């Protein structure tokens, strides 16, 4: 169907959206449901909670992915610690492009939560991030960003050659060339009228990066003052470097 082998292989590693939104969703009910009122059920904090869950999901996806599954645990940890927030942001973005609308945010659980709302129960420093993310959503919606392209970017974000002290550097650099070539082949063959979808798609990664940077600083700032419950995974990841 004019779809390069590599990409079809990358699509088989994708999780099944519904079963993921269900699991996570459940986990949250199983949460509140317990401490019915005494604790902290504020807005923002609920986000961190799902972000932490969206994270286990990313780890799961990577763990079962075609080339990543051949790396030793040390390298897998290095690659994941280097892009965990980018994968989150990318994920959130592709979800809005594929299942979002006007001014409504489609959460990982499957719940739409009017953009308007979210912006009224959160601080501006958070509001600004979300909005930075929503700008990309608009661009990517105009570029006809599809799932096949979405999986290619996940691998381009995960298999970064700019990570140092990797045991098997050649493999990471191999995957990287394997995917770029695939994404190029695909976008020109499937969207030939769009002169530079390829170039345009790649321009998004440094933007996704710069956003995950502000994201992490905000999170870190909110954590240094009990404004974040606890997410052994969110916080752990957050303390891989920290400066």
């Amino acid at each position: 169907a004019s779809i390069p082998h590599l990409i079809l292989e990358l699509l088989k590693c994708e999780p099944d959206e519904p079963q993921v939104q269900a699991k996570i969703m459940a986990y949250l009910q199983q949460e509140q449901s317990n401490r019915n009122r005494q604790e902290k059920l504020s807005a923002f904090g609920l986000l961190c909670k799902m972000a932490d869950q969206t994270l286990f999901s990313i780890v799961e996806w990577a763990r079962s992915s075609i080339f990543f599954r051949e790396l030793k645990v040390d390298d897998q940890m290095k690659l994941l610690q280097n892009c965990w927030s980018e994968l989150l942001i990318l994920d959130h973005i592709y979800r809005q492009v594929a299942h979002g609308k006007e001014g409504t945010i489609f959460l990982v659980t499957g719940e739409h939560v009017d953009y308007s709302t979210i912006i009224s129960h959160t601080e501006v420093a958070f509001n600004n991030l979300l909005s930075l993310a929503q700008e990309l959503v608009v661009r990517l919606r105009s570029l006809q960003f599809d799932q096949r392209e979405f999986v290619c970017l996940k691998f381009l974000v995960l298999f970064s050659s700019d990570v140092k002290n990797l045991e098997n550097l050649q493999l990471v650099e191999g995957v990287q060339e394997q995917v770029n070539a695939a994404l190029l082949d695909y976008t020109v063959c499937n969207y030939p009228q769009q002169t530079e979808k390829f170039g345009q798609l790649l321009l998004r990664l440094p933007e996704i990066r710069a956003i995950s940077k502000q994201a992490e600083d905000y999170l870190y700032y909110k954590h240094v003052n009990g404004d974040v419950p606890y997410n052994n995974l969110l916080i752990e990841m957050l303390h891989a470097k920290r400066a």
Binding site: F56, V59, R63, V73, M77, Q81, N232, E236, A240
Partner: peptide, 11 residues
């Protein structure tokens, strides 16, 4: 460092 939770998840 020796990423604890991530390790439990990756091994």
């Amino acid at each position: 460092s020796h990423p604890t939770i991530l390790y439990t998840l990756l091994s």
